[PDB]
Amino acid sequence: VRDEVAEKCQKLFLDFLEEFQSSDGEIKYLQLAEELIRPERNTLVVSFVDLEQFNQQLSTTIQEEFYRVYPYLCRALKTFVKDRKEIPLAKDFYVAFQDLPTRHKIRELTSSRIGLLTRISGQVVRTHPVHPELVSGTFLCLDCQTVIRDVEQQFKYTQPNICRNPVCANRRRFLLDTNKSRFVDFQKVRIQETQAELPRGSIPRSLEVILRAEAVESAQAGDKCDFGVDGYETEGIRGLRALGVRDLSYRLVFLACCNQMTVKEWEKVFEMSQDKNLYHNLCTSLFPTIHGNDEVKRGVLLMLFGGVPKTTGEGTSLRGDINVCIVGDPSTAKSQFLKHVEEFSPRAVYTSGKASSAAGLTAAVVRDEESHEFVIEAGALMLADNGVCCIDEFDKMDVRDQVAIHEAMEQQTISITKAGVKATLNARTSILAAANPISGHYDRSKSLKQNINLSAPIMSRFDLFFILVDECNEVTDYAIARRIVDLHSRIEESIDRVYSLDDIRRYLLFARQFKPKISKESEDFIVEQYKHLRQRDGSGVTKSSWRI
Amino acid sequence: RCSILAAANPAYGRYNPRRSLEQNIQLPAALLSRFDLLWLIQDRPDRDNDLRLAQHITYVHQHSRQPPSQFEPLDMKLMRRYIAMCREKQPMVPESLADYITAAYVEMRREAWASKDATYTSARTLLAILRLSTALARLRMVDVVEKEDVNEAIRLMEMSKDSL
Amino acid sequence: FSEKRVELLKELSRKPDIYERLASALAPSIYEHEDIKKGILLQLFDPGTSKSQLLQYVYNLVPRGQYTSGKGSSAVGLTAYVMKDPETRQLVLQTGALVLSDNGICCIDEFDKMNESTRSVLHEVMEQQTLSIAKAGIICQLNARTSVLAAANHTLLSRFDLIFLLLDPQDEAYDRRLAHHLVALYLDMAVLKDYIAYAHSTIMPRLSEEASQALIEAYVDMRKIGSSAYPRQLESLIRLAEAHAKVRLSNKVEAIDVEEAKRLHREALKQSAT
C-alpha cells in the first residue's frame, strides 16, 4: 500500500517548511527560496533531531523506501512556491538531506542491504565525462499507439510486446521522443575505500555509484567531504531476448546524494600543548639514525609543519608548498633510509616514487563498452593530497617526468587535456625530494657546467638549499654504527610513550577559519635584516647554487 | 618421453668460416648449448666424392638387388621383426668399465679447453659418455671380459670431436 | 615419534666430526665451491652449470612457486594480468607470481638478461622492501619479505643484493668426483617431514647481547678504503645471522662463520679495481 505512505510523507515534509525556531513566519522560507532560486545552487538541509522528535518513523520510512520516495519527491516537492506563477519558471532541480549520522563500511554494503545510504568516502578514480544517456522513452510508432506515462524507468528498453512491428530487422526507424523525455545523466565513479580504515592487504572493491548532475563536481574530485483471443493464438508465446540482462543485473544498483564532547577534547589536548621544545625531542626520537647534520634534520622537521596562506584580498595565488634540496651521498650506499622515516606518519598517503603503472599522462577514452586500461587520474600528485609526497628514482625525469613535475610545481594542479577532458585541481601538499650527484661536490676546480647533474627548470623552483661537505673523519664515523644496532635493542632501551604527539596537527585544522593577524612590527624587522644576508653572499662566499 | 630430433636451416646464408659463433649467429649460444649434439655439414668442393652420387642416384628403383652384399631379398615386413627380438634379450652393461673410461676423460678435458677455439665442451659431455655405452655395451653379449668398448666409446666422440 | 627425534640430536653429541657432517649431508647434489651451499642454506631457513638444475631443489621442496625468465616471460606473468572471463563476460583482477611469492623463496633465472627498459618492477621492491600493486583502480603494497639469489656480470649498481663471479680453477680433478658420483650413488625422510614443520611452529629467534659488538668489527677493517658503516650490508649481515641461531641451537652468534661471508663479497669486490 504505497499510496498512503507516499501521500503522508509529502504532507509531513510540506507542513514542515515553517520553523517554530528562528522567529516565525516565512522569513526563513524566503531565505531558503532566495538561496535556491537566485544562485541556482540547490543546497538544502533538514535537522534530524527535529525530524525524529516530530516523527522518528519518518527517517525509517525514507531509509527503507528511498527507491519509492525518489520519484514522488521529484515532482510534488516543486510545490514550495505555493503559487502557480513560479512553477513554469524552474525546469528541474534536486535537493536532499545531509549530515546522516549512521554509516557503514563500503565493502560490507551487501545487496541484502539495498535502500540504505552512506557517506561518499574515498578517492575518485576513473573519472567519466557527462552524458545524458537513455533513461525513459518509447520506440514504438505514434500511429500505432500513443506515448504512455509508465514505461522503461530502468536502463532496460520497452517491456510491452503489443504491435509486433519492430521484431523484423528489415526496417530503419529513428522516431525519438526528444520532446517529452527525462534524459539527464548518470555517471560511474570508481570510488576506492579508505586505505587508513583498510588493512595492509586490501584490494578494495569499487562500487557502482551513480551521481546526479547536481552531484557533478560539486566538491574537489578525489577527496572525502570533510567539513477472448485473436488469431486463434494460445498461451506460451515465446520470443524473449537475453541481450539486455547480462549488463545491469550483474552489478549493484542504488542512488547517491551529496556539547560536552568538544570541551572534553579541548581540556586534555590544549593543556599538554603548553609543553615547550617538543621539536628537540623529535630529533632523537623521529630520526634515530642521524649523526651530526643538525641543520639538515631541522629543515625536514620544520617541513612537517603546515600552514599555507590563501587568497582573501582577491589577489594572486600565493605559493605555500615546500621544495627542499639536500646535498648528501654521491649515490653510493644511499642514505635513502630517511625516506622510511617519513612512513611513520598517519593521516597521509605515501607515494612510491615514480616507478609505477603510470595510468596518467596517457589517458584515453574509457568507454570500450566494459572498461579501459588507462584511467583518468594523475595519481603522481593527486594521490599525494593532504599527506606527504616521496619521489624516489628521481633520475627518471628524462622526458615524461619533466613535463609533469614542473606544471604541477608551477600551478599546483594538473591540466590534463586530451580533446575530451580538461580540468584543474588543487593538490595542497608538500613535495619531499633529494637528488644525489655523480660523485660529489667538487666545483672548486671543476666547471659547474654538466657537473651538478640536475635539470634547471626543476632545481630552480626548490625552496631550500644546503651545503654538506663530507670528510673522512674517523673520529665520528667510529661511533656511527653504535646507534644503528641500538634500533634492535628494544628490550633494554626503549622510549616510553606517554602521550600521542599527533594532537598538534589537529590544532592547525581549526586554524583555517581563525585569523592569525601577525603583527607587522615583528615581520619587517627580519626583512630589513635580510638585506645584510643577500649582500654578504656576493662578497666571495663559497658557491653552490646561484639562486639567492 | 620421446626423443627430439632437430633440423636447423641456415640463417639466410651459409656458415661463415671467417666469423666465429656468438657473432655470426644472432641467437644466443646458451640456448643452443643446452642441446647435447650439434651437427653441421659443409658442402666442400670435393670433386671425387661428387662423382659417386650421379652413378649412385640411378641404382634406386633400377634393380631388385638393393642390399648389394648378397643379402637375400626377404619380405619387407620381416625386417622390422628381426629388430624386435634383439630388444627382448635385455643384456647387461658392465659397471666396472666406468672406472677405466674415467681415467681417459682427464686428458680429454685438458686438450679441449686449452684450444680456446669455437668448439668447446663442459660437464654436459659426461652425460654423453654414459649415454654412449647405452647402445654400445648391449650389442656385445660376452659377459666375460669387456675391453673394446672403451675405444669404441671414444671413437664415437672422435667423430663428434672437431666436427666444427 | 617424540622420543625418537630427541635421540637424533643427542646422538650427534658423541660424534666429534659433526661440524662438517651436517653441511655435507644436506643437498649433496650441489657442485664444488660450497660457498654457494652456505648461501642456499641461509636462504633455506657458462650458465646452467649445475645452476639451472639448482632451481629443482627449491621447487621440489616447496611446491608453491613459479619459474620466470627474461625475453621469454612478459610483464603480465608477475602482475597486471587483468583479463576477461570468456564464459561470463566480466573483468577479473588477476595477479601474478611475485604477488604470491611472499612468505616463500623466489626463483628468477637470467636476472641480468632483462633489458634496461624493463626490470622496473623489481627495482622498487628491492628498494622499498615491499611489493606494490599497480592496477586499474587499486594501488597498494604486498609485503615482500624474501631474498633474491642469482649470478651475473648511472650509479644504480647498488640495486643488486649479491654479485658473484665464477672462475675456472683449471683443475680437472674437481670434475672427476662428480663423474664417479653419479655411478657411485646408484632416516632422511623423517627429517624432511616433521622436523621442518615442528621447529617453525613456535621457535622464534631473539637477538642476544653478545652478538651486538660483533658487527662493529666489520667496518673497523673497512676504514682503510678511501684513507664501512654507511653501507646497509651491515643491516643485511645481521639479517642473515638468524641462520647461525638454528645451527647448534645456540641463540648467540660470534665472529666465527660470520667473517667468512665478508671474504665472499671481497673476492667479487676486488676484481673491480685495477
Per-residue b/e over A25-61, b at no fewer than 16 CB within 10 Å? eeeeeeebeeebbeeeebeeebebeebeeeeeebbeb
Nearby residues of A248 by Cβ (< 8 Å), 6 or more positions away: A154, A155, A156
Whichever domain contains A12, its CATH number is: 3.30.1640.10
Per-residue b/e over C195-217, b at no fewer than 16 CB within 10 Å? eeeeeeeeeeeebeeebeebbbe
CB-CB under 8 Å, A333 with C137? no
Closest CA to A129 of A327, A404, A416: A416
CA C84 to chain centre: 36
Closest CA to B101 of B143, B152, B142: B152
CB-CB under 8 Å, A370 with C91? yes
Longest CA–CA separation in chain C, Å: 69
CA distance to partner chain C, nearest, from residue B82 (Å): 33
CA distance to partner chain A, nearest, from residue C247 (Å): 22
Q: Can you tell me the distance from the alpha carbon of C28 to that of C54, in angstroms, rounded to the nearest whole number?
A: 11
Q: Which residue has the cell 566480466?
A: C90
Comparing CB atoms, the residue among C49, C173, C176 nearest residue B122 is C49
Q: Can you tell me the distance from the alpha carbon of A5 to that of A66, in angstroms, rounded to the nearest whole number?
A: 12
Residues of C in contact with B122 (CB under 8 A): 46, 49
Residues of B in contact with C46 (CB under 8 A): 122
CB-CB under 8 Å, C128 with A352? yes
The helix (H) or strand (E) run that includes residue B127 is helix B124-139
Residue C242 and residue C253 in contact, taking contact as beta carbons nearer than 8 Å: no
CA distance to partner chain A, nearest, from residue C20 (Å): 32
Q: Can you tell me the distance from the alpha carbon of B163 to that of A215, in angstroms, rounded to the nearest whole number?
A: 79
Q: Does residue C176 belong to the interface with chain B, where contact is any CB pair within 8 Å?
A: yes
In chain C, residues 55-94 whose CB comes closer than 8 Å to chain B = none
Residue B26 and residue B11 in contact, taking contact as beta carbons nearer than 8 Å: yes
Q: Following DSSP, what letter does each residue of A264-322 receive, concatenated?
A: HHHHHHHHHHT-S-HHHHHHHHH-TT--S-HHHHHHHHHHH--------SS--------
DSSP A167: T
Distances (CA, A) of A288 to A297, A346, A350, C204: 11, 19, 20, 26
CB-CB under 8 Å, C139 with A356? yes
Known binding residue C232? Answer is: yes
Q: Can you tell me the distance from the alpha carbon of A224 to that of B46, in angstroms, rounded to the nearest whole number?
A: 86
CA distance to partner chain A, nearest, from residue C36 (Å): 25
Comparing CB atoms, the residue among A335, A474, A481 nearest residue C215 is A481
**Three-class HEC string of C24-39:** HHCCCCCCCCCHHHHH
Q: Following DSSP, what letter does each residue of C180-206 receive, concatenated?
A: HHHHHH--HHHIIIIIHHHHHHH----
Closest CA to A269 of A501, A465, A522, A438: A501
Residues of C in contact with A332 (CB under 8 A): 155, 158
Distances (CA, A) of B66 to B54, B83, C246: 17, 19, 74
Burial class (CB in 10 A: 0-12, 13-18, 19+), B154: middle
Question: With touching defined as 3+ CB pairs under 8 A, do chains C and B touch?
Answer: yes
- Among A484, A490, A493, A494, the strongest candidate for a mutation testing the C interface, having the largest count of C CBs within 10 A, is A484
**How many contiguous H segments (helices) and E segments (strands) does chain A have?**
15, 5
Q: Can you tell me the distance from the alpha carbon of A411 to that of A487, in angstroms, rounded to the nearest whole number?
A: 42
Q: Is the dihedral of CA C151, C154, C159, C163 positive or negative?
A: positive
Angle at B113 between CA B111 and CA B116, to 5 degrees: 110
Q: Which residue has the cell 522528535?
A: A53
Grid cell listed for A370: 566494459
Residue C241's Cβ-side half-sphere holds a number of Cα atoms within 13 Å equal to 26
Q: Does residue C178 belong to the interface with chain B, where contact is any CB pair within 8 Å?
A: yes
Q: Is the dihedral of CA A331, A333, A335, A337 positive or negative?
A: positive
Grid cell listed for A531: 638585506
The partner residues of C92 in beta bridges, in order of sequence, read C83
Nearby residues of C264 by Cβ (< 8 Å), 6 or more positions away: C35
The phi, psi pair for C139, rounded to 5°, reads -115, 115
Q: Is the dihedral of CA C152, C156, C160, C163 positive or negative?
A: positive
Q: Which residue has the cell 618492477?
A: C121
- Among C51, C52, C53, C175, the strongest candidate for a mutation testing the B interface, having the largest count of B CBs within 10 A, is C175
Chain A neighbors (3+ CB pairs < 8 Å): C
Q: Can you tell me the distance from the alpha carbon of C122 to that of C111, in angstroms, rounded to the nearest whole number?
A: 11
Q: Does residue C123 belong to the interface with chain A, where contact is any CB pair within 8 Å?
A: yes
**CA dihedral of C233, C235, C240, C246, whole degrees rounded to 10:** 160
DSSP C131: E
CA-nearest residue to C82 within chain A is: A373
In chain C, residues 130-149 whose CB comes closer than 8 Å to chain A = 132-143
Grid cell listed for B116: 680456446
Residue C144 and residue C136 in contact, taking contact as beta carbons nearer than 8 Å: no
In chain C, residues 102-161 whose CB comes closer than 8 Å to chain B = none
CA-nearest residue to A358 within chain C is: C134
CB-CB under 8 Å, C228 with A477? yes
State the helix-helix crossing angle for C233-240 and C260-270, rounded to 10 degrees. 140
- A450 φψ region: left (φ > 0), alpha (ψ -120 to 50), beta (else): left
- Fill in the amino acid letter for A531: K
Per-residue b/e over A131-165, b at no fewer than 16 CB within 10 Å? eeeeebbbebeeeeeeeeeebbeeeeeeeeeeeee
CB-CB under 8 Å, C178 with B126? yes
DSSP A324: E
Burial class (CB in 10 A: 0-12, 13-18, 19+), A207: buried
Q: Following DSSP, what letter does each residue of A484-541 receive, concatenated?
A: HHHTT-TTT------S-STHHHHHHHHTTTS-----HHHHHHHHHHHHHHHHHHTTTP
CA C253 to chain centre: 20
- What SS3 class is residue A477? helix
Burial class (CB in 10 A: 0-12, 13-18, 19+), A479: exposed
This structure's resolution (Å) is 4.3
Residue A324 and residue A462 in contact, taking contact as beta carbons nearer than 8 Å: yes
The partner residues of C131 in beta bridges, in order of sequence, read C142
Closest CA to A166 of A127, A139, A128: A139
Q: Can you tell me the distance from the alpha carbon of A301 to that of C9, in angstroms, rounded to the nearest whole number?
A: 54
CA B143 to chain centre: 26
Nearby residues of C234 by Cβ (< 8 Å), 6 or more positions away: A481, A484, C215, C218, C219
Residue A26 and residue A18 in contact, taking contact as beta carbons nearer than 8 Å: yes
Known binding residue A439? Answer is: no
Residue range(s) defining the domain that contains residue A24: 4-96
Known binding residue C71? Answer is: no
Instruction: Give rounded-to-5 percent helix, strand, coil for chain B.
Output: 50, 0, 50
Which technique was used to obtain these atomic coordinates? cryo-EM
**Size of the A and C interface in Cβ pairs below 8 Å:** 102
Residue A96 and residue A142 in contact, taking contact as beta carbons nearer than 8 Å: no
Q: Can you tell me the distance from the alpha carbon of C229 to that of A480, in angstroms, rounded to the nearest whole number?
A: 7
Residues of C in contact with A397 (CB under 8 A): none
Residue A239 and residue A223 in contact, taking contact as beta carbons nearer than 8 Å: no
State the helix-helix crossing angle for A66-75 and A2-14, rounded to 10 degrees. 60
Q: Can you tell me the distance from the alpha carbon of A425 to that of A151, in angstroms, rounded to the nearest whole number?
A: 41
Q: Can you tell me the distance from the alpha carbon of A432 to that of A254, in angstroms, rounded to the nearest whole number?
A: 41
Grid cell listed for A119: 557517506
Q: Can you tell me the distance from the alpha carbon of C62 to that of C65, in angstroms, rounded to the nearest whole number?
A: 7
Closest CA to A128 of A215, A205, A186, A182: A186
**CA dihedral of A213, A219, A222, A223, whole degrees rounded to 10:** -140
Burial class (CB in 10 A: 0-12, 13-18, 19+), B105: middle
Angle at C23 between CA C17 and CA C28, to 5 degrees: 120
Q: Can you tell me the distance from the alpha carbon of C131 to that of C152, in angstroms, rounded to the nearest whole number?
A: 23
How far apart, in Å, do the first and last CA atoms of chain A sit? 77
Q: Is the dihedral of CA A530, A531, A534, A538 positive or negative?
A: negative
CA distance to partner chain B, nearest, from residue C165 (Å): 18
Q: Can you tell me the distance from the alpha carbon of A405 to that of A414, in angstroms, rounded to the nearest whole number?
A: 9
Residue C232 and residue A335 in contact, taking contact as beta carbons nearer than 8 Å: no
Q: Can you tell me the distance from the alpha carbon of A452 to that of A69, in angstroms, rounded to the nearest whole number?
A: 67
Q: Can you tell me the distance from the alpha carbon of C123 to that of C129, in angstroms, rounded to the nearest whole number?
A: 10
Closest CA to A6 of A75, A81, A80: A75
Grid cell listed for A455: 635539470
Closest CA to A440 of C108, C226, C99: C226
Closest CA to A121 of A207, A212, A200, A217: A207
Q: Is the dihedral of CA C81, C87, C91, C92 positive or negative?
A: negative
CA distance to partner chain C, nearest, from residue A357 (Å): 6
CB-CB under 8 Å, C80 with A357? yes
The phi, psi pair for A284, rounded to 5°, reads -70, -45
The partner residues of C142 in beta bridges, in order of sequence, read C131
Q: Which residue has the cell 662463520?
A: C257
Question: With touching defined as 3+ CB pairs under 8 A, do chains A and B touch?
Answer: no
Closest CA to A295 of A482, A474, A544, A464: A464
CA-nearest residue to C223 within chain A is: A474
CA C273 to chain centre: 27
- A152 φψ region: left (φ > 0), alpha (ψ -120 to 50), beta (else): left
CB-CB under 8 Å, A200 with C143? yes
Known binding residue C31? Answer is: yes
Burial class (CB in 10 A: 0-12, 13-18, 19+), A390: buried
Known binding residue A312? Answer is: no
Closest CA to A100 of A117, A114, A123: A117
Grid cell listed for A386: 593532504
Comparing CB atoms, the residue among A331, A359, A373 nearest residue C155 is A331
Q: Does residue C47 belong to the interface with chain A, where contact is any CB pair within 8 Å?
A: no
Q: Is the dihedral of CA C66, C202, C234, C45 positive or negative?
A: negative
DSSP A210: E
The partner residues of C68 in beta bridges, in order of sequence, read C108
CB-CB under 8 Å, A392 with C128? yes
Residue B37 and residue B160 in contact, taking contact as beta carbons nearer than 8 Å: yes
CB-CB under 8 Å, C172 with B109? yes
Longest CA–CA separation in chain B, Å: 54
Grid cell listed for A12: 509531513
Closest CA to B106 of C29, C180, C48: C180
Residues of C in contact with A357 (CB under 8 A): 80, 134-135
